[PDB]
């Protein structure tokens, strides 16, 4: 038959890919980083505690100036904080309180959100009326909208729970590119620093590197055993770490095309919800379900530190573009800014 | 004195006014009831919404006896259930619509599975979920008027081969209700209210109001520490 022919061809191709990947692993990262000195202990104290949310905080994102925050909570509210003085600069009421993502524009003018209504709302912050209007409502996804990232003030990259990501032009409101190829629900995005590539992790134990220009899945990385909940690029854009639901972070490489490192600890069996590198890429901060965030030495897979100031499950993390602070949102309706 | 400039003090004023508005809006929201509406496909959810004077989440608001209810229908959300049910952790009750005649019907492409078994599988998955350890459930056994014809024609031996009762509506309904309520594994932390409805039953909102009042008073007595 033709179906079995195509399936056997696909299996031969998968075996060829695995053989080519094994032919490049001449050494491991733990064998090359054996003589490098360890990081030591990292004790980071809670500098700020932002209160004002009345329900679970589901996402946050630092402004590009490393001072302003946006944080979305199923109170129905999207609050824009001034993290230096804990002032609430803005408070935006959502039309649908089931928000699961938010994003702050890299210019500071717009703020996106979305959630269990399949609609990405673009709010304009700097209007002449001093108010905060809904600049756009991008619709077209058929599942819950899990993540959201501003490519530019005009283009946005969303990823929804109908096994697809999309690239919207905000000025018109139409999907100019639909990245398909995943089979499970897409849960996280991470744009490259050079903003020409982005990776997406599904509920399929698979992350995919897409080219945002053409709309073709460049590469596919497997290796996890459960759902992938968070991805972040390494600061140079040639590696990325995925946190999965089986209590494991994994550092994959783009040029080597393989999994490089496995961050796991035997006393940790809780799913991971947030991953973010430090500014230099030496630290990997991972938010877990056991109410704390572990800080791993990203080059040795040691566990350099713990951030254990929260009372409920830790939602999205954030590291400033200056690398000065680490903001942590959680389900106990508090943000905590560590340093 | 406080080293803040004029604009800093005015920014703190704006922050405090935003805090006041947030507190007032949260107080307005906390006085509302949030009912999560669940059930198998074509169990009669839409019939229930039509009876109670009313893509993504379909959110329906209605007031009754100076109590505002917000009913969240999530049957349109076709994705992994375990990826978004945890955002409904703080609802006051889970209405669960189960069709009664559906014990002798099959819906999906899987023709070998009787859809009442799938319905109570879904009930067992929702009731024993780790996010709803203390969220009360309000059963609604729908279309009891059409149940009697199927009782006369086809007994429960099709759906329950271990059936001991006779072909009468009362014993069959009692056995179905018992089989459903015995799927609860958290009988001490959570109550299951059951009600038999039909198309003309206009006492549905009254039963929902009674159950919600019970759950609210029990929650208040739990916050007081008395219960």
């Amino acid at each position, epitope marked *: 038959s033709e179906l079995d022919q195509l399936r056997q061809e696909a299996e031969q191709l998968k075996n060829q890919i695995r053989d080519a990947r094994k032919a490049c692993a001449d050494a491991t990262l733990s064998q090359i980083t054996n003589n490098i000195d360890p990081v030591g202990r990292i004790q980071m104290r809670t500098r700020r505690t932002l209160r004002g949310h009345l329900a679970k905080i589901y996402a946050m994102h630092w402004g590009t100036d490393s001072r302003l925050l946006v944080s979305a909570s199923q109170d129905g509210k999207l609050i824009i904080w*001034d993290s230096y003085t804990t002032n609430k600069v803005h408070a935006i009421p959502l039309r649908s309180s089931w928000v699961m993502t938010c994003a702050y524009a890299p210019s500071g003018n717009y703020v996106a959100c979305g959630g269990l209504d399949n609609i990405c709302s673009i709010y304009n912050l700097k209007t002449r*009326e001093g108010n905060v209007r809904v600049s756009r409502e991008l619709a077209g996804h058929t599942g819950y909208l899990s993540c959201c990232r501003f490519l530019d003030d005009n283009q946005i990259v969303t990823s929804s729970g109908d096994t697809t990501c999309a690239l919207w032009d905000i000025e018109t409101g139409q999907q100019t590119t639909t990245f398909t190829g995943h089979t499970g629900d897409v849960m996280s995005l991470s744009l490259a620093p050079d903003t020409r590539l982005f990776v997406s992790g599904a509920c399929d134990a698979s992350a995919k590197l897409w080219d945002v220009r053409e709309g073709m899945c460049r590469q596919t990385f497997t290796g996890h055993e459960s759902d992938i909940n968070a991805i972040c690029f390494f600061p140079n854009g040639n590696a990325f770490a995925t946190g999965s639901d089986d209590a494991t972070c994994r550092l994959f490489d783009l040029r080597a095309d393989q999994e490089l490192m496995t961050y796991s600890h035997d006393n940790i069996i809780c799913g991971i919800t947030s991953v973010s590198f430090s500014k230099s890429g030496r630290l990997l901060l991972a938010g877990y379900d056991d109410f704390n965030c572990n800080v791993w030495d990203a080059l040795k897979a040691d566990r350099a530190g713990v951030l254990a100031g929260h009372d409920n499950r830790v939602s999205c993390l954030g590291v400033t573009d200056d690398g000065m602070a680490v903001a942590t949102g959680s389900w106990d309706s508090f943000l905590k800014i560590w340093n | 004195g406080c080293t803040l400039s*004029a*604009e800093d*003090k005015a920014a703190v004023e*704006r922050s405090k006014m935003i805090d006041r508005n947030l507190r007032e809006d949260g107080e307005k929201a906390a006085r509302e009831v949030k009912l999560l509406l669940l059930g198998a496909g074509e169990s009669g959810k839409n019939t229930i919404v039509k009876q109670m004077k009313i893509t993504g989440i379909v959110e329906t608001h209605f007031t009754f006896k100076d109590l505002h209810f917000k009913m969240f229908d999530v049957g349109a959300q076709r994705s992994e259930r375990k990826k978004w049910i945890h955002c409904f952790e703080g609802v006051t009750a889970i209405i669960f619509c189960v069709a009664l005649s559906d014990y002798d019907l099959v819906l999906a492409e899987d023709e070998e599975m009787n859809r009442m078994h799938a319905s109570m599988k879904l009930f067992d998955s929702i009731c024993n979920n780790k996010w709803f350890t203390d969220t009360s459930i309000i059963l609604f056994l729908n279309k009891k008027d059409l149940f009697e014809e199927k009782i006369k024609k086809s007994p429960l031996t099709i759906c329950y081969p271990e059936y001991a009762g006779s072909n009468t509506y009362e014993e069959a309904a009692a056995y179905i209700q018992c089989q459903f309520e015995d799927l609860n594994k958290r009988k001490d932390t959570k109550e299951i209210y059951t009600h038999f409805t039909c198309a003309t039953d206009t006492k549905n909102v009254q039963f929902v109001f009674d159950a919600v009042t019970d759950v609210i008073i029990k929650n208040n007595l739990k916050d007081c520490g008395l219960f």
Partner: single-chain antibody, 232 residues
Framework: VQLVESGGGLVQPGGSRKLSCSAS????????MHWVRQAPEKGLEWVAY????????YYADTVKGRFTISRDDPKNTLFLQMTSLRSEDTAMYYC??????????????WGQGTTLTVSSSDIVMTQATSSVPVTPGESVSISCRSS???????????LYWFLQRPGQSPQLLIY???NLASGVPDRFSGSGSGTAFTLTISRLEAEDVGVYYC?????????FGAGTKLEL
């Protein structure tokens, strides 16, 4: 965005009046509002301030006790109730919008102003000259010297540059000594430090002629300057 004042006219000394500033086209309930008067020739002087809700109310020491601000949010209206007018209050009064948060642009919109004629420590800011001649196309530089160091400890300097065209309300040009206001062409630039500030303009036009004022926002009362005038 529109602010229209009303209630001017001729008043006998010692009388009373009530100026009303009707706002239309913005979220009036969230903006702090100011009344700023201008004598027939002397330049701008700050009068009074009302907060975002009805919070802190400040007054210039020369009008403390005689004037009072009311604010009606549901009708979008500002009120300056004056009692016991003197011959020093004959002036054109401007209603001024200003919102304060991080990165905000206060004093950004000025009403058209109403004329009130009456029948018959502090940060002093000095502008160097009263008039300098210009030709359209050459760069110019205006100076403003404060008496106190406007550089606050949190990093901000709080000097504002306004321009008043002949026969119009003064618009905002530069806020906090560096930042341009939205809608201002990038010919104006601000610089300086401590107690010395400069506004450098690139190639001039026929619409850049006017009077340039500097102001300090450290502490109330906000003290304007003399007003450097340009002539073609």
């Amino acid at each position: 965005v529109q602010l229209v004042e009303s209630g001017g006219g001729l008043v006998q000394p010692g009388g009373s009046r009530k100026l009303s500033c009707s706002a239309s086209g913005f979220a009036f309930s969230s903006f702090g509002m100011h009344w700023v008067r201008q004598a027939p020739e002397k330049g701008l002087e700050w009068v009074a301030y009302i907060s975002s809700g009805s919070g802190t109310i400040y007054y210039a020491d020369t009008v403390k006790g005689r004037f009072t601000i009311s604010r009606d949010d549901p009708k979008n209206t500002l009120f300056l109730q004056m009692t016991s007018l003197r011959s020093e209050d004959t002036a054109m009064y401007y209603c001024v919008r200003s919102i304060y948060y991080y990165g905000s642009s206060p004093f950004d919109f000025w009403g058209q102003g109403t004329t009130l004629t009456v029948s018959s420590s502090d940060i002093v800011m000095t502008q160097a000259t009263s008039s300098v001649p210009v030709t359209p196309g050459e760069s110019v530089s205006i100076s403003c010297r404060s008496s106190k160091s406007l550089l606050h400890s949190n990093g901000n300097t709080y000097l504002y540059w306004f321009l008043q065209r002949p026969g119009q309300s003064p618009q905002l040009l530069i806020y906090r000594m560096s930042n341009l206001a939205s809608g201002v062409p990038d010919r104006f630039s601000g610089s300086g430090s401590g107690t010395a500030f400069t506004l450098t303009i690139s190639r001039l036009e026929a619409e850049d002629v006017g009077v340039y004022y500097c102001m300090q926002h450290l502490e109330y009362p906000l003290t304007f300057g003399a007003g450097t005038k340009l002539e073609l």
